């Protein structure tokens, strides 16, 4: 463990958390990240951590989850922090304010957060112009193994969810290495309930037709991001549609609307999605199920409660090719990224894996 890891985890982040409400702390974290005001990434990525998936090289398998950089303001700072890939968004077609404040709550005793932001978004046109300003810088980053994902949402008052996603594909698809469609924010009325199988097939058919219409250099992979709260029937139906349509991958999982027994935080009964440690094993088990139902042929990005190398390797062994985190960064600060990478490399060696690739889905064998 480094000097920075202990200083951020034991002293700086708890002190800042004592001074700032979580939304103010997030806004300051995005601004500092955007300005490069972040500790030196002392972890040189080894060859063991390189992954080839979704038509791209990934220098390391640890990404920043959607929601940290909703509006594409801090992408370059996030690579500087040591992430192997960045996902921005969710981005909605039109700008929207999201829910009234307060709308995010820390559960420090649980190493958890509850959020109900409600897709606050600068909208597609603002994010398009932001990504255009650094499009060729991003082309070089992607070529050097640091890809960019864009997570697409829908407006609260949309009368045609599939058309909102199609607009996102047309506008930001040409600027993305991969696109994500949520069947899964807990904080918009109707999004998770297009699990109705024929309706999911109709939505994803439209999204894939729009993606296929882009020029080859500008044609991203398309992934579906799912909730951890799906029925067995919902998971069977998603696996079926994903294989039928040739969806490129899955992101498993979003936040949970469940409240696991044992939460201690005073704010545990706030409305919203729960993230961090209490989500971890529900997310790992969802990865394991989706990997089996897709016969290991559909790349999975594993997300929920990753804050250590062990957490990352458990999701990789369950079937994830890549992992993401958000809530750990909230609690432990920037040093957590190097921590996860160092711990994951050590555990791969301890368990006899030549690299990340050899560990993907190892538990199923
Ligand atoms: N050339 C190196 C350099 O300028 N380093 C630097 C390191 C820390 C800070 N910094 N200074 C403060 C304070 F309190 F003194 F003003 C706070 C931090 C800090 C604290 C937490 C985060 C970040 C940056 C991002 C971030 C993202 C996710 C969560 C927490 C934070 C920066 C500023 C600069
Ligand atoms: C404050 C907050 C905002 C989020 N916003 C989004 C979003 O806009 N789109 C999305 O797909 N996921 C969003 N997520 C979910 C994360 O991408 C991730 O799936 C989830 O938080 C689990 O990872 P974690 O336990 O490492 O935070 C958000 C999560 C948090 C905590
Ligand atoms: O904007 C939000 O409220 C949000 C979106 C999402 O997909 N997940 C989440 O936990 N919150």
């Amino acid at each position: 463990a480094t000097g920075d890891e202990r200083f951020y985890a034991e002293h700086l982040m708890p002190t800042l958390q004592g001074l700032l409400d979580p939304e103010s702390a997030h806004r300051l974290a995005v601004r500092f990240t955007s300005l490069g005001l972040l500790p030196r990434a002392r972890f040189q990525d080894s060859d063991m951590l390189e992954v080839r998936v979704l038509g791209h090289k990934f220098r390391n398998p640890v990404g920043i989850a959607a929601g940290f950089d909703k509006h594409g303001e801090a992408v370059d700072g996030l690579y500087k922090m040591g992430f192997g890939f960045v996902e921005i968004g969710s981005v909605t077609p039109k700008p929207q304010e999201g829910n009234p404040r307060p709308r995010v709550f820390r559960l420090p005793e649980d190493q958890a957060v509850i959020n109900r932001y409600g897709f606050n978004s600068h909208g597609l046109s603002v994010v398009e112009h932001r990504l255009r300003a650094r499009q060729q810088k991003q082309a070089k980053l992607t070529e050097d193994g640091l890809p960019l994902g864009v997570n697409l949402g829908k407006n609260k008052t949309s009368v045609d969810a599939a058309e909102d996603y199609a607009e996102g594909v047309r506008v930001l698809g040409p600027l993305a290495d991969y696109l994500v469609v949520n069947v899964s924010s807990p904080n918009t009325a109707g999004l998770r309930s297009l699990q109705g199988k024929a309706e999911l097939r109709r939505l994803l058919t439209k999204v894939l037709q729009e993606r296929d219409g882009l020029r080859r250099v500008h044609r991203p992979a398309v992934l579906v991001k799912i909730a951890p709260d799906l029925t067995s029937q919902d998971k069977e139906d998603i696996a079926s549609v994903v294989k039928e349509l040739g969806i490129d991958g899955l992101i498993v999982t979003n936040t949970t609307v469940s409240r696991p027994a044992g939460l201690q935080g005073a704010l545990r009964s706030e409305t919203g999605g729960l993230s961090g440690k209490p989500l971890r094993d529900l997310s790992t088990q969802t990865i394991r199920e989706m990997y089996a139902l897709t016969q290991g042929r559909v790349p999975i990005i594993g997300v929920g409660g990753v804050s250590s190398g062990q957490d990352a390797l458990e999701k990789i062994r369950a079937g994830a090719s890549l992992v993401q985190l958000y809530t750990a960064l909230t609690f432990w600060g920037p040093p957590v990224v190097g921590k996860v990478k160092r711990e994951l490399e050590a555990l791969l060696k301890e368990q006899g894996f030549g690299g990340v690739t050899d560990a993907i889905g190892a538990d199923h064998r």
Side-chain angles (χ1 to χ4, degrees), residues 28 57 80 101 149 194 205 229 232 272 274 330-331 341:
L28 263 24
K57 180 172 74 197
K80 183 184 180 178
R101 295 181 180 130
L194 80 211
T205 295
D229 306 319
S232 294
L274 177 77
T330 299
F331 283 107
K341 292 187 307 176

Side-chain angles (χ1 to χ4, degrees), residues 35-106:
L35 288 167
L37 296 169
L38 59 114
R40 302 54 58 190
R42 12 79 299 268
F43 182 90
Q44 166 63 50
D45 291 340
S46 88
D47 294 340
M48 284 188 70
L49 293 184
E50 183 179 310
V51 178
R52 294 182 175 268
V53 65
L54 298 172
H56 293 282
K57 180 172 74 197
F58 291 78
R59 276 190 21 192
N60 76 62
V62 181
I64 180 71
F68 178 81
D69 190 5
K70 276 176 176 286
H71 327 292
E73 291 173 297
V75 177
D76 293 302
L78 289 159
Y79 293 123
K80 183 184 180 178
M81 201 174 301
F83 288 110
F85 62 110
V86 168
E87 190 173 312
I88 68 156
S90 297
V91 189
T92 61
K94 303 168 179 175
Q96 64 171 39
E97 295 302 287
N99 286 324
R101 295 181 180 130
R103 53 198 180 171
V104 57
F105 306 96
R106 286 179 308 223

Side-chain angles (χ1 to χ4, degrees), residues 70 115-119 182 185-187 254-255:
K70 276 176 176 286
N115 88 85
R116 48 165 184 268
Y117 271 99
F119 295 94
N182 295 343
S185 170
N187 307 310
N254 216 311
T255 57

Side-chain angles (χ1 to χ4, degrees), residues 200-271:
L200 181 62
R201 178 185 297 113
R202 186 190 76 81
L203 161 69
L204 297 180
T205 295
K206 179 166 172 145
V207 164
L208 288 175
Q209 174 181 132
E210 286 318 291
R211 183 280 300 274
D212 289 346
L214 300 176
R215 290 168 61 101
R216 179 174 40 210
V217 161
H218 293 285
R219 194 181 296 152
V222 172
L223 290 80
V224 173
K225 181 168 180 181
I226 68 171
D229 306 319
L230 299 177
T231 65
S232 294
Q233 179 70 261
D234 293 334
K235 287 175 243 184
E236 282 179 17
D237 289 352
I238 292 160
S240 176
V241 173
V242 157
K243 286 180 295 168
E244 173 197 351
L245 296 183
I247 285 283
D248 299 302
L250 292 164
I251 305 193
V252 185
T253 67
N254 216 311
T255 57
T256 185
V257 299
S258 79
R259 293 294 184 271
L263 293 177
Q264 296 306 308
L267 305 177
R268 67 186 186 187
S269 290
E270 287 294 340
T271 289

Side-chain angles (χ1 to χ4, degrees), residues 28 78 138 193 211 300 333 345:
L28 263 24
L78 289 159
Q138 184 64 52
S193 282
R211 183 280 300 274
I300 293 167
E345 179 182 351

Side-chain angles (χ1 to χ4, degrees), residues 136-190:
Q136 294 310 130
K137 172 179 263 183
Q138 184 64 52
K140 294 191 176 64
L141 286 161
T142 296
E143 182 176 25
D144 199 24
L146 297 172
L148 177 68
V150 176
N151 186 310
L152 299 176
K154 61 164 198 303
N155 284 119
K156 184 172 182 176
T157 60
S158 171
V159 298
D160 186 352
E163 190 55 22
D164 281 25
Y165 293 118
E167 295 171 348
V169 174
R170 290 198 290 266
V171 176
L172 297 183
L175 289 149
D177 297 313
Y178 73 82
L179 290 175
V180 186
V181 181
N182 295 343
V183 303
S184 80
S185 170
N187 307 310
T188 293

